[PDB]
Amino acid sequence: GILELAGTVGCVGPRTPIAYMKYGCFCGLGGHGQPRDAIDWCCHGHDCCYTRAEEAGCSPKTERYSWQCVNQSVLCGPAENKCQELLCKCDQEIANCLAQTEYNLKYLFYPQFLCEPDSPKCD
Numbered sequence: 001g002i003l004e005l006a007g008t009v010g011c012v013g014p015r016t017p018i019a020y021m022k023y024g025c026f027c028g029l030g031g032h033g034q035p036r037d038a039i040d041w042c043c044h045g046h047d048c049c050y051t052r053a054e055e056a057g058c059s060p061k062t063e064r065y066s067w068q069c070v071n072q073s074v075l076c077g078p079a080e081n082k083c084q085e086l087l088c089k090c091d092q093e094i095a096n097c098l099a100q101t102e103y104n105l106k107y108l109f110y111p112q113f114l115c116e117p118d119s120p121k122c123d
């Protein structure tokens with residue numbers, strides 16, 4: 001869930017998870033448009049991952065799952081079911097993605113009216 005999303009992102013990366021609560025066109029609840037930067041691409045990818053999780057019958061915003069932070073890396077488990085494993089994989093992925101990015105302050109609280117109606121496709 002959101003608790004583990006924040007936790008995993010904090011574990012791996014250099015910055016507060018507050019940094020991604022409203023950033024670019026995709027970091028934040030929902031999102032649409034051309035991603036502005038690497039960070040925004042990570043968030044688009046995560047949005048897709050969560051969409052897939054929901055299509056599989058999971059609740060990616062709420063379900064609790066166990067994980068470990070070891071040397072600023074996320075280890076997923078123990079998993080009681082497939083939803084817990086899918087969710088941790090999604091969050092592990094974005095955490096790794098964001099940890100490799102430079103922050104562009106100008107995209108924090110970016111205006112939604114500059115974000116295009118359509119978005120790039122999900123893998």
Ligand SMILES: NC(=O)c1cc2ccccc2n1-c1cccc(C(F)(F)F)c1
Binds near residue numbers: 009026028
């Ligand atoms: N892919 C995202 O949008 C996203 C990425 C991210 C990273 C750290 C902390 C939060 C983060 N979010 C986010 C922010 C607000 C609401 C939601 C929710 F999952 F509820 F949609 C998700």
Ligand SMILES: [Ca+2]
Binds near residue numbers: 029030047
């Ligand atoms: Ca989003």
Ligand SMILES: [Cl-]
Binds near residue numbers: 014015016
């Ligand atoms: Cl910070």
Ligand SMILES: [Cl-]
Binds near residue numbers: 030
């Ligand atoms: Cl939603």
